[PDB]
Every structure is written in structure tokens, then in C-alpha cells.
């Protein structure tokens, strides 16, 4: 929904789960499950292999979702030296550097964390 998300083209999806090597026809429980695919690299995974809740799955499927390694901070659009400590929203899975949150964070939030776009 962000302007810079409506604007970056989407890479061709790979129709194989990077984690279990199944397709949309077979996840780890040998049942069909649609894949989610990274908009930048095209790699895909079952939501069940990504450990996404059903609610989070619905939301990321409607967004320009990025995999763990491709994730860029939604504020500064960078990864940078602090990329490994980038927070992932538990509602939309967007990434934010702690220093790029509104308000900026000095310490890691405890428990489930929802980003500045998602909180009412």
C-alpha cells in the first residue's frame, strides 16, 4: 500500500517451496497449500513452512512481500550494517530498523510487535 511498494515490479515466482521443496500441491503434511513468493528474488515458501499465522498470511499476500534476506526497511529502504536486527512486523511482516521506527526504539520490543503502519 506504500507508494514505493506499488511501484517496484515483481520478480518471476519460483513454484517450489525453498524449505520443503514441495509445490502448491504438497506441503510438509502432504496437503495442498498455496505458496507465497518474494517480490524481489522470486523464491517461494508455504506459509506453514514460513511459520506464518493465517492472519499474517492473508495480509502479506496483499502486499509486496519480501523474504527474510531481501527485506528492506520500509522507512529508509536500506538494509545496512544493522540489517540482522531489523524488526519484522507481526501484522504485515514489513521490516523496520529500530532507529527508523516512529518513535525510534532503543531496545528490542518484548513479545509480538506491530509496526507504525499497522497500529491504530
Amino acid at each position: 500500500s506504500l507508494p514505493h511498494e506499488k511501484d517496484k515490479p515483481v520478480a518471476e515466482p519460483i513454484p517450489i517451496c525453498s524449505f520443503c521443496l514441495g509445490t502448491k500441491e504438497q506441503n510438509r503434511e502432504k496437503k495442498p497449500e498455496e505458496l507465497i513468493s518474494c517480490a524481489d528474488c522470486g523464491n517461494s515458501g508455504h506459509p506453514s513452512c514460513l511459520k506464518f499465522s493465517p492472519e499474517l498470511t492473508v495480509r502479506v499476500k496483499a502486499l509486496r512481500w519480501q523474504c527474510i534476506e531481501c527485506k528492506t526497511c520500509s522507512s529508509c529502504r536500506d538494509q545496512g550494517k544493522n540489517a540482522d536486527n531489523m524488526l519484522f512486523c507481526d501484522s504485515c511482516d514489513r521490516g523496520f530498523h529500530m532507529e527508523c521506527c516512529d518513535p525510534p526504539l532503543t531496545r528490542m520490543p518484548k513479545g509480538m510487535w506491530i509496526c507504525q503502519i499497522c497500529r491504530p
Binding site: I14, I16, S18, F19, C20, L21, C49, L50, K51, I68, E69, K71, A83, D84, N85, M86, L87, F88, D90, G95, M108, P109, K110, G111, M112, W113
Partner: peptide, 25 residues
């Protein structure tokens, strides 16, 4: 909270790339 680092660990490792290639072939 979830970070890139902790998500990498909690999710579990990806399958071997060579096996992902023999699948896609």
C-alpha cells in the same frame, strides 16, 4: 519481537540448493 536474525533461526533452514535445482529441472 521478530528480527531478521531470529526469523532465520525460528523458521528453520532452507533445503539444499542443489536439491532445489534438481527439483526445478
Amino acid at each position: 519481537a521478530r528480527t531478521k536474525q531470529t526469523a532465520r533461526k525460528s523458521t528453520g533452514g532452507k533445503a539444499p540448493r542443489k536439491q532445489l535445482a534438481t527439483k526445478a529441472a
